[PDB]
Ligand binder design. Structure first.
Ligand SMILES: C[C@H](c1cccc2ccccc12)N1CCC(C(=O)NCc2cccc(F)c2)CC1
Ligand SMILES: [Zn+2]
Length: 312
């Protein structure tokens, strides 16, 4: 018997295929799904006629389309994306404080913090799978975006994860092509030195939560002797992300865009997100509390930027 169905790896280009009556889908299409339903080992029915199956890039056309959509060559990627989607599609995405958040499940609080921060930054993704899923996320349909974050970060539903590390992976697919950071390492003796950073390191800094501190000078146990200071001479980007091991830190209105706090120890703990609106909002998955000032164990802080150049 002859039956007509569609395959795809990007949900955008569908390919008409003629499936054989007898055999299942795995020895015909390889690994195959149908609405997150691993029917690789399931025989073809007849209500199938006309419907669309996901598959793995078996041939040059599918591999090229997968690459164009996802911007990865990783052969495990699509399977990993699928098994995450099975779960994330069961998560809830309420609107909290004007933003799409995520109701706690499967230690997804780090993901909620990543999702909340991104919505407040002037940032776009170059990979079409990310830009499309993100558009939908901002509108409350975030299951796909979350599964994609997991897949790009090499993380699995149910693991706790680190927000900074996650952003490190995601921002490699962000519109950073024009971002630029110039730092100066100065010394009492040693000498004078300038460093230019681009891509991810133009916007991500690890070692202080304070953007002011990076502007006035941050100190470090030097390589030739005593006390090197690092100071920002120039910044070109729409935001910066300052991270540090969690530490007691006061967040005041009008001084930052948003932040993550982390309570617990390295192995096990809990993130919440703080954003500065008419007052401070602390968004803890589905829950909201409000406060005029916060002091607690902050670990990332986001600040708005356009262009900065130094006075030193
Ligand atoms: C922000 C926080 C963090 C980031 C950077 C330095 C830290 C030092 C002490 C405590 C926390 C620190 N960070 C948050 C997420 C954490 C995480 O992913 N834990 C999962 C895990 C599970 C099992 C073992 C393990 F080491 C870690 C890993 C650490
Ligand atoms: Zn030096």
């Amino acid at each position: 018997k002859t039956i007509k169905v569609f395959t795809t790896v990007d949900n955008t280009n569908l390919h008409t295929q003629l499936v054989d009556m007898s055999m299942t889908y795995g020895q015909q299409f390889g690994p195959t799904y149908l609405d997150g339903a691993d029917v690789t080992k399931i025989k073809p029915h007849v209500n199938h006629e006309g419907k669309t199956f996901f598959v793995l890039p078996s041939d040059d056309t599918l591999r090229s389309e997968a690459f164009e959509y996802y911007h990865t060559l990783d052969e495990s990627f699509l399977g990993r994306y699928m098994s995450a989607l099975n779960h994330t599609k069961k998560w809830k995405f309420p609107q909290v404080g004007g933003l799409t958040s995520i109701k706690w499940a499967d230690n997804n609080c780090y993901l909620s913090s990543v999702l909340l921060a991104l919505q407040q930054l002037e940032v776009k993704f170059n990979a079409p799978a990310l830009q499309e899923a993100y558009y939908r996320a901002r509108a409350g349909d975030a299951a796909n975006f979350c599964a994609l974050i997991l897949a790009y970060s090499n993380k699995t539903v149910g693991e706790l994860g680190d927000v900074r590390e996650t952003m490190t992976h995601l921002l490699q697919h962000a519109n950073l092509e024009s971002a630029k950071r110039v730092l100066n390492v100065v010394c009492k003796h040693c000498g004078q030195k300038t460093t230019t950073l681009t891509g991810v390191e133009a916007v991500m800094y690890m070692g202080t939560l304070s953007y002011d501190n990076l502007k006035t000078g941050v100190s470090i146990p030097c390589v030739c002797g005593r006390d090197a200071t690092q100071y920002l001479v120039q910044q070109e980007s729409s935001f910066v992300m300052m991270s540090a091991p969690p530490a007691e830190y006061k967040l005041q209105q009008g001084t930052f865009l948003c932040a993550n706090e982390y309570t617990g120890n390295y192995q096990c703990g809990h993130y919440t997100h703080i954003t500065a609106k008419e007052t401070l909002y602390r968004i803890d998955g589905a829950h909201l509390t409000k406060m005029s000032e916060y002091k607690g164990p902050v670990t990332d802080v986001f600040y708005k930027e356009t262009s900065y150049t130094t006075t030193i």
